[PDB]
Paper text:
The soluble ACh-binding proteins (AChBP) from mollusks form homopentameric assemblies of subunits homologous to the N-terminal, extracellular ligand binding domain (LBD) of the nAChR. The binding pocket of AChBP possesses all of the functional residues identified in the nAChR LBD, and its extension toward various directions of the interface provides multiple means for selective accommodation of the nicotinic ligands. The ligand binding pocket encompasses a nest of five electron-rich aromatic side chains provided by residues Tyr93, Trp147, Tyr188 and Tyr195 on the principal (+) face of the subunit interface and residue Tyr55 on the complementary (−) face. This pocket is partially sheltered from the solvent by loop C, which is found at the outer perimeter of the pentamer and harbors at its tip a disulfide bridge linking the vicinal Cys190 and Cys191 residues, linked into a Cys-trans-Cys disulfide bridge (aka oxidized cysteinyl-cysteinyl ring), a signature determinant for nAChR α subunits.
Initial electrophysiology experiments on nAChRs and binding and crystallography experiments on AChBPs were carried out using the racemic spiroimine (±)-4. Co-crystallization of A-AChBP with the (±)-4 racemate unambiguously led to a bound (+)-4 R enantiomer at all five subunit interfaces in a virtually identical position to that seen in the (+)-4 R complex, with only a minor trace (i.e., occupancy below ~10%) of a bound (−)-4 S. Per se, this observation would suggest a much lower dissociation rate for enantiomer (+)-4 R relative to its (−)-4 S congener than the one recorded through the binding studies. Whether this is due to the more acidic and hydrophobic composition of the crystallization liquor used for the (±)-4 complex compared with the other two complexes or to conformational remodeling of the complex during crystal nucleation and growth is unknown. Overall, the DX scoring approach appears consistent with the prevailing presence of enantiomer (+)-4 R in the structure of the complex prepared from the (±)-4 racemate. In all three complexes, the loop-C position shows a high degree of variability with respect to the different orientation of the 3-ring system in each enantiomer associated with slightly different orientations of the bound enantiomers at each binding interface. In the (±)-4 and (−)-4 S complexes, loop C clusters around intermediate positions in all five subunits. However, the loop-C “intermediate” positions associated with its loose interactions with the spiroimines resemble more the position observed in HEPES-bound or apo AChBPs than that in complexes with small agonists.
Numbering used by the authors:
A (entry chain B), D (entry chain D): -8 to 208
B (entry chain A): 0 to 208
C (entry chain E): -3 to 207
E (entry chain C): -5 to 17, 20 to 208
The structure:
């Protein structure tokens, strides 16, 4: 009837009003600073090792990367907006961290829509699915001990004074690993590292993804 | 000329004169009907366990904000529009290995009751072991489709049939289809209280001899 | 004077047509449109018998005619036509029905508009499509076919036509790996069980063999 | 010097003013007409034959194409703009000619920034570097006389009544040709042609690039 | 605590607005610019002797300085630098002179601006370029070279320099198929027949062989 449709129009109007208040009526978040640093939580879900090229020492992974962070500027009171407690939004409408693989050999291919979820406490969750080619020698992959490769993920432009990274666990989520992959996973870890480079006095933070794998027999 | 003016006026009223639809919510949910028409298994790569399908995916949904009265617009009952002018659902394959390649123009049909129909043709690479494809029983592969970001409380999926449409399947494909089904599934994940919905596409196929 | 005036007249004409008139929203059942299609086949680049895909290079002449693009040349310094970005105008959504890869566009997206309202648009394309090349290494060669038509409009909104059923082969690459034995382009009226309206396509049929 | 700093500020202000006068304050050039035709000068500099594929009869060239033309609407008096005699601008800010290879088999890949130089007399110079795949039978490439291939370049949509082409020379510039290419160049010419096609009563102009090449020994 | 954070954000938003929304057409003969280049070579991924193309992965440090990007930190809560989209600022059109494919960009297009007006931009890239790998399976290895410079500006508008002639090899992939015997980056001044003005490039010269 009318009243059901009216409720739906009101819920839409509340959401449109909330997004307008947050985005159109506030300068966009200029990113973290030394005085206002930000912690980004990263977690990997490895779906498949698609290919290991021993002629070029490149390996191709398919995974999704959970990214979470929290901004005061994205907070609201649900009671002021019809009890809206979260919403979906284009990743282009918000600031997102510039988390980059440090040893890719090809631009990352994006396999999922660029949409994030924002919650009323200001927390953002963004889960890009990706295919990554990275530097990896697959020697030993046809052996019982398998091959080991590693790739670091972190901000390309922010030091540890502006962006800290963490993981919720050092165990990579392997529960959705493709059971009929050409490669089986012996272990996969994701470990926060504090790095010093000779160029720079400031510390840099990365998450090191280490995968040990071999040919499935 | 009046029919053109009426259509231009209708599109202007819907699009230019209404704040853009922010997507479905718990309070304003949406059902998307999905159906597959499989045209070709182009390639089955046993060196990487990837298979490439060509298909078109019929997507239908309905928005109150896209409704109009035909009598107010010269008895226009529907129109074609760029898919960029409207909200579209983020239906995603859960086990692709490459970005989907779009093979058809990004245009939808909107009807006066607010229903939208959008039929993207696609080439998809997905995770699939083709072992057995050179046998009578063939190989079986599966891939799930659903929203990447919305739970079942915002977007429900359904199919009109569990039979994949094979009436357009390429007769000289390298592979013949033994069966193809499309089935709604309700899943829970430990992170989350809400249900998640997918459609599971299951294809059994073998080398054409 | 004259060259400055011809420029000024053209700028004025384009402004009058584009900036000062609501844009054509496409055809409808009440206001249907004829689109003429013709193919010029330049090259069969590749025939892959491991996947049954063939790659063609061709250009597709598309013609249609709109009242809203008409003008009187006498009101615009005897300008009888002009070139314009295909993004400035409506263009038909003509699609191959059995491609296996996105079409690669090889020419600039520019159309010619004439004072009688006729539009001509000639996109050059590389297309991979479903094709079994069995027989290509024989005297009789192989035969493949691909249908082209609107993706979203029925025969009640867009009627598709050809000026001839002969594909233009006068630009076919003489040192191609493949020679063309015949190439035809034929209008077809199709009924599908989903739908009461007729659908129109042009069926491109190419018979070819190794040179 | 403070005067030196002031001059620099003024030169910047003058250039911004000039670009604003030309671009923001004038209807954009709608292209040539039968009454107001345009001559484009083309020259090719061939850098490399990268690949000659005899399984598909496609050859891949890397070259840059100098394009020059002149518009009355891009003229200014240097004395009105602090003696600015030219400027660099994004090729997206100006009209550029639709010069197209007639027998490419793949979209051209652009290897250089899309920036042109405009001079006060209204002349424009634009030098896109490109990788082109085109139709070419490389039979004979492993012989003393080598293989010969040809590709025509011209407007896709304008006849010779609206766009004329010319070359300053019929010799392709070979002074940048890669000395350790897989292929050596025996000759490379660029020749203006006036062509009649049965479709069309107006004549069409192209520049025919003819390259004779063989495997380097 | 929260107020300080809001103020630091407001100061940065204000600084970016002052610099960008409330004010560079590129260098000119009257207002020339020096760009410093340095290369960090990460991997020789592939050396194709059938086409004489080699593929490198590296990052290229670019540095330059503009008066129009200067500010006083004391007027903006002691902000001494900030990160910004490379689309918000002018960037130099530094181009490889002998690429055979469009460069693939491997890093986000974000730069760091410092209060003295200096900009640092470090694009990571995969480049295919013209290179004969003959001798790569020998002790002396192969040598290839590629020049980088502006595509549209002469030495009257853009000068280049390097901070060192040694390419940074400290990030070179230890299990690459190729080992680096040497890698240098050298400024060159060129005169061409077409043109009276000088042209500047940085010549990257790499000697490499199969890891054995
Ligand atoms: C994090 C980062 N981004 C920009 C360039 C590469 C890198 C990481 C590798 C070493 C140098 C580096 O530069 C500055 C600090 O660290
Ligand atoms: C749709 C989706 N979104 C982001 C994470 C991955 C995935 C898809 C694979 C299974 C878990 C999942 O999450 C919740 C629902 O389904
Ligand atoms: C033109 C078209 N539209 C979108 C779906 C696919 C197709 C073409 C293949 C057969 C069915 C079809 O649908 C209805 C009419 O024709
Ligand atoms: C330049 C051009 N434009 C569009 C189609 C192809 C071509 C070139 C090959 C012959 C015909 C042609 O058309 C008109 C005259 O020239
Ligand atoms: C820098 C540059 N720009 C565009 C064309 C190619 C090149 C570089 C190779 C020699 C000629 C050249 O032009 C002028 C001087 O330098």
């Amino acid at each position: 009837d009318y009243k059901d449709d009216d409720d739906k129009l009101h819920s839409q109007a509340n959401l449109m009003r909330l997004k307008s208040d947050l985005f159109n009526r506030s300068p966009m978040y200029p990113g973290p600073t030394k005085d206002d640093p930000l912690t980004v939580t990263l977690g990997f879900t490895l779906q498949d090792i698609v290919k290991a090229d021993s002629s070029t020492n490149e390996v191709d992974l398919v995974y999704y990367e959970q990214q979470r962070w929290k901004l005061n500027s994205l907070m609201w009171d649900p009671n002021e907006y019809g009890n809206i407690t979260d919403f979906r939004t284009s990743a282009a409408d918000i600031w997102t961290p510039d988390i980059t693989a440090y040893s890719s050999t090809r631009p990352v291919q994006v396999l999922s829509p660029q949409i994030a979820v924002v919650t009323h406490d200001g927390s953002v969750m963004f889960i890009p699915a990706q295919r990554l080619s990275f530097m990896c020698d697959p020697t030993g992959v046809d052996s019982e001990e398998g091959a080991t490769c590693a790739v670091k993920f972190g901000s390309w432009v922010y030091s540890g004074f502006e962006i800290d990274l963490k993981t919720d666990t050092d165990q990579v989520d392997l529960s959705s690993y493709y059971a009929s992959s050409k490669y089986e996973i012996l272990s996969a870890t994701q470990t926060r590292q504090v790095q010093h480079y000779s160029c720079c006095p400031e510390p840099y933070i990365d998450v090191n993804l280490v995968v040990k794998f071999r040919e499935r027999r």
